[PDB]
Amino acid sequence: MRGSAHVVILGAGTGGMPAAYEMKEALGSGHEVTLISANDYFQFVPSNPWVGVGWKERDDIAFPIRHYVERKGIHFIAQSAEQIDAEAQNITLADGNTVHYDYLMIATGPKLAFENVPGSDPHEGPVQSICTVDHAERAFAEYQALLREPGPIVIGAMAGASCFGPAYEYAMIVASDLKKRGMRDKIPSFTFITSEPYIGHLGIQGVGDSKGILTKGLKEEGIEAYTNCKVTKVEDNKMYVTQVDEKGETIKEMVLPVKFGMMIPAFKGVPAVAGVEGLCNPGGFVLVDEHQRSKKYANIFAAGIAIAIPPVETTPVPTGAPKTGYMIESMVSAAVHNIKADLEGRKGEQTMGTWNAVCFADMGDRGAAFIALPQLKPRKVDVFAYGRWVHLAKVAFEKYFIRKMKMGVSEPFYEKVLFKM
Amino acid sequence: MRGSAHVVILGAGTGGMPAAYEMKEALGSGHEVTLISANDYFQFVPSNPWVGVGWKERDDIAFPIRHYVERKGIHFIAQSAEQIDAEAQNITLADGNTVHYDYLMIATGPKLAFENVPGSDPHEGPVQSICTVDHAERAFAEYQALLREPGPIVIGAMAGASCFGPAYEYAMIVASDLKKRGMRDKIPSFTFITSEPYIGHLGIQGVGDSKGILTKGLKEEGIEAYTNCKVTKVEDNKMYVTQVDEKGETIKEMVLPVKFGMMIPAFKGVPAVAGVEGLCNPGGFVLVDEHQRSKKYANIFAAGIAIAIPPVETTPVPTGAPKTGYMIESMVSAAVHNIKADLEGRKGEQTMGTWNAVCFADMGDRGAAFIALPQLKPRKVDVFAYGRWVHLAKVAFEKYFIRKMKMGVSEPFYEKVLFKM
Numbered sequence A, B: 001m002r003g004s005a006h007v008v009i010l011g012a013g014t015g016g017m018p019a020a021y022e023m024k025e026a027l028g029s030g031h032e033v034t035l036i037s038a039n040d041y042f043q044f045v046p047s048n049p050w051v052g053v054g055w056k057e058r059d060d061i062a063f064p065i066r067h068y069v070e071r072k073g074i075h076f077i078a079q080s081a082e083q084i085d086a087e088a089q090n091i092t093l094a095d096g097n098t099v100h101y102d103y104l105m106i107a108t109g110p111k112l113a114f115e116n117v118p119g120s121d122p123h124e125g126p127v128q129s130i131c132t133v134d135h136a137e138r139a140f141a142e143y144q145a146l147l148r149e150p151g152p153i154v155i156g157a158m159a160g161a162s163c164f165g166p167a168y169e170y171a172m173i174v175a176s177d178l179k180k181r182g183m184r185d186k187i188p189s190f191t192f193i194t195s196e197p198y199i200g201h202l203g204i205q206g207v208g209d210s211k212g213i214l215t216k217g218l219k220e221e222g223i224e225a226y227t228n229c230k231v232t233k234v235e236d237n238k239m240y241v242t243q244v245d246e247k248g249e250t251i252k253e254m255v256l257p258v259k260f261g262m263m264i265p266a267f268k269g270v271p272a273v274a275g276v277e278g279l280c281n282p283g284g285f286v287l288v289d290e291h292q293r294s295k296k297y298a299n300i301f302a303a304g305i306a307i308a309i310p311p312v313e314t315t316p317v318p319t320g321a322p323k324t325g326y327m328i329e330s331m332v333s334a335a336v337h338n339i340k341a342d343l344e345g346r347k348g349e350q351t352m353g354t355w356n357a358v359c360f361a362d363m364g365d366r367g368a369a370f371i372a373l374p375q376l377k378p379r380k381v382d383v384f385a386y387g388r389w390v391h392l393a394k395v396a397f398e399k400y401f402i403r404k405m406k407m408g409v410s411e412p413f414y415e416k417v418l419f420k421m
């Protein structure tokens, strides 16, 4: 509505939740802010690997959204968008209802593209996922089934994956949990399959000594590792893998039996968003400018995994660079600021800032973390760290993030990085 | 003078120079700001090791102070304080002149305590220093003399030292320069002597994997390393060393011939400051509070190496924790803010912030850096990094810092750490 613009935020995840609060905080009581998401609960996704091995419960890492955002004056609709007509600016929900918007802020994260690898969907074979708590709970249940009936383990990342950290994390804690159950010696073979050109490439051409450290780690745990691999199909509990060389030629094909498995899938854009004509690249990722504004529709903004970021390298086997938390927050802040500026007749000039990747993996008593920026080398910061303190930090950050998602944020997010003052 | 208070800044070094500008910027044209220092030039001290091996010239890393601060309205006096009467608030200069102050900001850095080890003064034996460009130039001249007449090399850090980084740096680049001259094989023995309880303790109980990395480094270069060592005397070109165990007992004594040497000395407070009654601890370091204000004299503030920081551990052989650049700047900012507040009838509440150490060592094509905070473990940040990018950063930072010392700072120093926005 004119003068009382209605802003809709699609997706209540790492970018979406904060976007809701920030938007409402910025616009005030004169504008309608509606948050629409497929689930009625928020989940802290960096914790999913731990759920997948049973180190955490769903209840530890998730909570119902409604109360917390409604107490802030945000309208919550727990329904997935099935369709977005950008011309009429209407969104059709799963239940057939439709919602109009004056501005749209898309934060739908990834579609897990299991279909790239026939048989790889967690519901159709032994290869599970820890990308969502629903999947991680299923991974754990299968993990227990491996405990009762031991057989070969296969963990890694598919062709086109962009989130490698968690595969390493999951492989280490599995190994770790297998020992603490005195069950490790009952595993016939524990294999790490990755699409990375080398161990610890991480989709970012490596950070610090991640190659050396992740390699050593997989050896400590007795995990055999293969790089430059694409899984072509999962079938009869066997993983068909092709391994290439620097020039894409095939150097071998393997068939790996799998009693228990977990492969990071490739990410695509969700269907409702990918389905909007001229909105997205062929991956279904929203093409936006420096200001987070759709290049096709001026009243559509995007943040998080949903946006497209051009590649800067090409690997023998296709891989993506990850989109991580601090950068997503920069995107969210910028989108909110610029939408606000639009509502006030200005060109918002705020941008995402410098590309960066930050990731924290907890392996139990200690953890690994990295910070890399910008995307291309030589970087301004290229750090890989390991220690008990990385563990303590992950723990503290999750405690913090979840609290903030309940109390609300205003909130130039990341006064966390102010533990100096 | 009443209403036109006169602020004097003693020492034009890493804290002192910025303090001068910041002070003047903060107080404005209504107050006299005078900067007093022993040298008429500013020097970027982190570059001294490179001068010491001849990779840099004095002219690359130093410049005359007067013009640059006078163009800002700051009075410059190139004379050392010989005496400070805190009662009368007068400072006596080397030439016998005296200067009155309403507020005193002490930034005199360290007295290099060669006297702790008889014979160790660079003017009385083969053991040189790279702490100042004057000394580093002398180190280099002796280095050349070693080239013409090869013999044993000894590099390290004395008992009571608090700046270890640069010893490692200097040892590596010496080794490095020896190879590039095809002269390394002409060295009979290259020994690293340190007061640290172990390699890469760095006076901070280690950071990340500094133990493993510095150890490996000294092996690559063929340098034999001894920890828990105190030098007792230098005499007849021989270094008399005592090595202790965890419990301070002696486990051996060595006599090492030295053709070329460089040991980081212990730091004490300069005489003029240490000489002020009740001002300092027995080391001659100014006892200040959280706000950088002397605990004895309310109109005396201090920043930089000049202040006392209580130890948090005790090593078999006495060692200190380093006081590094970013923390010194926090000290300076706080002192300036709180002096300003005093001039305006408020209690300044600003503090140094969290204790931290940050250090960058360039070894030529690549460098090592670390960040640790706070002082005690487990830390919130405990990182040790190595790579070409650390080199690129040191280079960029020096270029930047020196520029800022000429243009002036206002200047909530460290918008450098804003290469995100």
Ligand SMILES: Cc1cc2nc3c(=O)[nH]c(=O)nc-3n(C[C@H](O)[C@H](O)[C@H](O)COP(=O)(O)OP(=O)(O)OC[C@H]3O[C@@H](n4cnc5c(N)ncnc54)[C@H](O)[C@@H]3O)c2cc1C
Residues within 6 Å of the ligand: A010, A011, A012, A013, A014, A015, A016, A036, A037, A038, A039, A045, A046, A047, A048, A049, A079, A080, A081, A082, A107, A108, A109, A110, A130, A131, A132, A163, A165, A166, A270, A272, A303, A304, A305, A306, A323, A324, A325, A326, A328, A358, A359, A360, A361
């Ligand atoms: C296992 C795991 C570990 C990770 N570890 C880290 C880490 O250590 N540090 C880091 O910085 N990053 C981490 N990431 C990367 C990144 O931070 C997360 O993936 C993050 O959650 C992405 O946030 P988002 O807002 O883009 O997407 P999401 O958090 O996935 O949120 C998208 C939301 O949109 C909803 N949605 C989707 N489709 C629709 C639809 N059609 N209609 C309505 N709602 C819809 C979903 O339900 C979801 O709530 C991790 C990623 C994963 C998977």
Ligand SMILES: Cc1cc2nc3c(=O)[nH]c(=O)nc-3n(C[C@H](O)[C@H](O)[C@H](O)COP(=O)(O)OP(=O)(O)OC[C@H]3O[C@@H](n4cnc5c(N)ncnc54)[C@H](O)[C@@H]3O)c2cc1C
Residues within 6 Å of the ligand: B010, B011, B012, B013, B014, B015, B016, B036, B037, B038, B039, B045, B046, B047, B048, B049, B079, B080, B081, B082, B107, B108, B109, B110, B130, B131, B132, B163, B165, B166, B270, B272, B303, B304, B305, B306, B323, B324, B325, B326, B328, B358, B359, B360, B361
């Ligand atoms: C070789 C070397 C490498 C270092 N590397 C790093 C690094 O990588 N990163 C980092 O953060 N820190 C580094 N440091 C540590 C620290 O940052 C420096 O020592 C820094 O210069 C200390 O600043 P300051 O202001 O306390 O003392 P200084 O820079 O030493 O300045 C003190 C000033 O006071 C003057 N003065 C002394 N006595 C008198 C007197 N009686 N009257 C008048 N003037 C006087 C001196 O001439 C000098 O100008 C390094 C230290 C050294 C020695």
Ligand SMILES: CCCCCCCCCCC1=C(C)C(=O)C(OC)=C(OC)C1=O
Residues within 6 Å of the ligand: A014, A046, A324, A325, A326, A327, A329, A358, A359, A360, A371, A394, A397, A398, A401, A416, A417
């Ligand atoms: C140079 C930039 C440093 C910023 C990061 C330091 C502290 C926060 C860690 C990053 C992080 C963010 C932002 C984050 O949003 C997130 O949740 C999705 C994490 O998972 C635990 C993160 O690790």
Ligand SMILES: CCCCCCCCCCC1=C(C)C(=O)C(OC)=C(OC)C1=O
Residues within 6 Å of the ligand: B014, B046, B324, B325, B326, B327, B329, B358, B359, B360, B371, B394, B397, B398, B401, B416, B417
């Ligand atoms: C967590 C805090 C990080 C701050 C440091 C990042 C960039 C600057 C490096 C620190 C530094 C400072 C402050 C500094 O003042 C200085 O000169 C004495 C250095 O020597 C090169 C430094 O390396």
Ligand SMILES: [Au+]
Residues within 6 Å of the ligand: A130, A131, A132, A163, A166, A264, A265
């Ligand atoms: Au995933």
Ligand SMILES: [Au+]
Residues within 6 Å of the ligand: A162, A163, A164, A165, A166, A322, A323, A324, A359
């Ligand atoms: Au990721």
Ligand SMILES: [Au+]
Residues within 6 Å of the ligand: A162, A163, A305, A321, A322, A323, A324
């Ligand atoms: Au990702």
Ligand SMILES: [Au+]
Residues within 6 Å of the ligand: B130, B131, B132, B163, B166, B264, B265
């Ligand atoms: Au020194």
Ligand SMILES: [Au+]
Residues within 6 Å of the ligand: B162, B163, B164, B165, B166, B322, B323, B324, B359
């Ligand atoms: Au130092």
Ligand SMILES: [Au+]
Residues within 6 Å of the ligand: B162, B163, B305, B321, B322, B323, B324
């Ligand atoms: Au120091």
Ligand SMILES: [S]
Residues within 6 Å of the ligand: A162, A163, A164, A165, A166, A202, A322, A359
């Ligand atoms: S990652």
Ligand SMILES: [S]
Residues within 6 Å of the ligand: A162, A163, A267, A305, A320, A321, A322, A323
């Ligand atoms: S991603």
Ligand SMILES: [S]
Residues within 6 Å of the ligand: A163, A164, A165, A166, A322, A324, A358, A359, A360
């Ligand atoms: S990640």
Ligand SMILES: [S]
Residues within 6 Å of the ligand: B162, B163, B164, B165, B166, B202, B322, B359
């Ligand atoms: S240091």
Ligand SMILES: [S]
Residues within 6 Å of the ligand: B162, B163, B267, B305, B320, B321, B322, B323
């Ligand atoms: S120091």
Ligand SMILES: [S]
Residues within 6 Å of the ligand: B163, B164, B165, B166, B322, B324, B358, B359, B360
């Ligand atoms: S240092």
